Design brief:
326 residues; three-stranded mixed beta sheet; 13 helices; 12 strands; 40% helix; globular; binds NADP nicotinamide-adenine-dinucleotide phosphate; binds the ligand O=C1c2c(O)cc(O)cc2O[C@H](c2ccc(O)c(O)c2)[C@H]1O; oxidoreductase; Epimerase_deHydtase; nucleotide binding; NAD(P)-bd_dom_sf; dihydroflavanol 4-reductase activity
Length: 326
């Protein structure tokens, strides 16, 4: 058969984007992978080495801060997977340097998609930080819950600008799509764990593996955390792109637990690494999982393939090669 319609993946050199490019290639797609510097071979080479990239992968230069930088890559495509997002959070002007750029970059992508005229559906990768960041945590969250931007700007917890960046970018994309009759899917992943192709530790694996290492500043994140295997997320993003009935936001979380429960699992399953018994900055006593419901996606027929055990087994190995002690 022929390639299943040219699709674009923004941020293809990244943790999520590189794997989605892989999975889209395996699924029979012609993939137009976007990067800020097609010349940085350290970042681009792992993509070109992917199975099937020689025939159906092409690399394009684009930057969310440069208007029109994406028009060429999008022209003639049937779909666009927006995965790139500004990841700088050591800013002194978070607003004009992280927030507005994130919101203006997604809207420019949406504008490019509408003007291309060939795109049938846009898949925006959101984050759980656009759902459950509020003063009083609920026991269950789904695609109808939205983070409280005002509360984020008020208390300015660690990582506040990213949550607000992504929550506004999510709302912006949805509004633009509704105003212009565009078909937009919004996929909400929690902390993503899985293999990686870069030679640098993905940030989400720093958090996921903070209990084996000693990354105590990451303990607060694991307090009440949800996970998804990177492979399941990328599969779900392809599933949602191909299902004609999909529409709107989708939660893509397959596991919810607490720091205590995770430490328990790692103790029993990895006697080799020493797991702390008391975690700095947590202490206290009663923590109950906060669940992210994926019922909308599962109802459409999607099924998760991997367990949290599968996630760490794969994260360990790809890091045991380099980046972590054995
Ligand atoms: N990993 C998780 O746990 C998780 C959970 C929920 C949602 N997400 C979302 O998944 C998506 C991918 O994130 P990630 O985990 O894979 O982190 P990542 O590896 O840092 O990927 C981010 C990508 O965005 C690109 N990027 C940054 N600024 C850009 C710009 N101005 N123009 C074009 N590209 C730019 C980066 O390319 P450069 O190499 O050139 O900087 C980078 O490849 C994000 O939208 C994230 O919010 C991730
Ligand atoms: O994007 C996300 C993210 C990320 O990209 C990088 C990183 O290092 C940690 C992260 O954690 C976020 C998160 C997970 C579970 C939640 O309950 C929540 O509110 C937020 C996640 O959404």
């Amino acid at each position: 058969a022929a390639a299943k319609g040219p699709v674009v993946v923004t941020g293809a050199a990244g943790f999520v984007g590189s794997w989605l490019v892989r999975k889209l290639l395996r699924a029979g797609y012609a993939v137009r992978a976007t990067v800020r510097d097609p010349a940085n071979v350290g970042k681009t080479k792992p993509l070109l080495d992917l199975p099937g990239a020689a025939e159906r992968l092409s690399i394009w230069k684009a930057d969310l801060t440069e208007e029109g930088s994406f028009d060429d890559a999008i022209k003639g495509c049937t779909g666009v997977f927006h995965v790139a997002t500004p990841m700088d959070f050591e800013s002194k002007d978070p607003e004009n340097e992280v927030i507005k750029p994130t919101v203006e970059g997604v809207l420019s992508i949406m504008r490019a998609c509408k003007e291309a005229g060939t795109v049938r559906r846009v898949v925006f990768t959101s984050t759980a930080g656009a759902v459950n960041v509020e003063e009083r945590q609920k026991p269950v969250y789904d695609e109808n819950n939205w983070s409280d931007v005002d509360f984020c700007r008020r208390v300015k917890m660690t990582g506040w600008m990213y949550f607000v960046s992504k929550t506004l970018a999510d709302k912006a994309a949805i509004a633009y799509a509704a105003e212009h009759g565009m078909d937009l899917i919004s996929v909400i992943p929690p902390l993503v764990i899985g293999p990686f192709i870069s030679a640098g530790m993905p940030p989400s694996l720093l958090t996921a593996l903070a209990l084996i290492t000693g990354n105590e500043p990451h303990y607060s994140i694991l307090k009440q955390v949800q996970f998804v295997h990177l492979d399941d997320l990328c599969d779900a993003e392809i599933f949602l792109f191909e299902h004609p009935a999909a529409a709107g936001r989708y939660v893509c979380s397959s596991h919810a637990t607490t720091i205590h429960g995770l430490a328990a699992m790692l103790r029993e399953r990895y006697p080799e690494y020493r797991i702390p018994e008391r975690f700095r900055g947590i202490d206290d006593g009663d923590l109950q999982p906060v669940h992210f419901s994926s019922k909308k996606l599962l109802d459409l027929g999607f099924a998760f393939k991997y367990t949290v055990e599968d996630m760490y087994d794969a994260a360990i190995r790809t890091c045991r090669e380099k980046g972590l002690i054995p």
